[PDB]
């Protein structure tokens, strides 16, 4: 009963995964990450520019 | 919560107690002894409930007598299953094994 | 208290956690606000259970 | 890239909160890594979860030692003895779990 109310809790840590998907780190890095391919892009623009 | 699969199925009512509660089941095969269980196919699913079981000879032969042939028993193959809801009481309503 | 401690101010929407102040905020202030952005979803979950 | 990042960092906090798992229930890893690794690929693909597929399935509790269990089954047959995989047709689908 105690691992099944613990994996109904782990069930349920969607919700906190999901929110954490959204948090500060989590813009910092797909900031970072788009940083690098916005870059990428970037230099493709004006290049072409 | 559905009423279908919580409401108590009614399998025999009283017979007076006098006289005994007779069934003579001279086509002694597994659906009709240990009777059967329906499958009513609501919304394309065959769901199934308590209400969907249907009393055999031997549901209706509680408190009274169960009259049976041999030959219907050692013919259809259903004595075994008998012999079996006889020693362990287990009656099992059949099902299509669809 | 702990983002009053460099002098910045606080806005939360329920869900969602966050402060306003100009300038970057300190690095382990927003590792305080994930922990308590985390315990405080969590605390969620152990409430509806 | 942003899929494989995000299901690293599923990675990481699912192994923070399965740790204190992992040693509460020592020999029940295998289980826990699996279900890491399905929250894992629910953060990197979005694809979805159901409980009903990830809850274990109580199979027999405790008789309390004394007596031992004794299951008697004179009626041995395969469905009784390795007992039976039910089949739930929901929208249509003998989906099972």
């Not at chain 2, 219907?72 to 287990?90: I, M």
């Not at chain 4, 798992?21 to 699996?34: G, I, S």
């Not at chain 4, 009903?52 to 399935?57: E, F, I, L, S, Y």
Request: glycine share 6%.
């Amino acid at each position: 009963i105690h691992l099944a109310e613990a994996v109904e809790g782990l069930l349920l840590e969607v919700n906190r995964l999901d929110e954490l998907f959204r948090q500060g780190s989590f813009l910092r890095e797909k900031t970072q990450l788009e940083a690098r391919f916005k870059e990428a892009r970037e230099q493709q623009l004006e290049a072409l520019r | 919560l559905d009423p279908a699969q919580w409401r108590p199925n009614l399998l025999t009512s009283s017979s007076s107690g006098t006289p005994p509660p007779i069934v003579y089941e001279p086509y002694a095969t597994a659906p009709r002894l240990f009777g059967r269980l329906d499958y009513l196919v609501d919304r394309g699913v065959w769901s199934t409930n308590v209400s969907l079981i249907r009393p055999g000879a031997v549901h209706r032969a509680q408190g009274g007598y169960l009259i049976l042939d041999a030959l219907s028993l050692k013919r259809e193959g259903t004595w075994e299953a008998f012999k079996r809801a006889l020693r362990n009481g287990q009656v099992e309503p059949v099902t299509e094994p669809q | 208290r702990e983002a009053q401690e460099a002098g910045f101010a606080l806005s939360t929407n329920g869900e969602r956690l966050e402060l306003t102040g100009p300038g970057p905020v300190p690095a382990e202030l927003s590792a305080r606000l994930e922990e308590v952005t985390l315990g405080s979803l969590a605390a969620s979950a152990e409430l509806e259970v | 890239a942003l899929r494989r990042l995000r299901r690293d960092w599923a990675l990481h906090y699912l192994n923070n909160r399965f740790e204190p798992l992992f040693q509460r229930f020592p020999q029940a890893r295998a289980y826990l890594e699996a279900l890491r690794a399905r929250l894992a690929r629910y953060a990197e693909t979005g694809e979805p979860l159901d409980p009903a597929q990830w809850r274990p399935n109580l199979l027999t509790s405790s008789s309390s030692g004394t007596p031992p269990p004794i299951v008697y089954e004179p009626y041995a047959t395969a469905p009784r003895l390795f007992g039976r995989l039910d089949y739930l047709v929901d929208r249509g689908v003998w989906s099972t779990n």
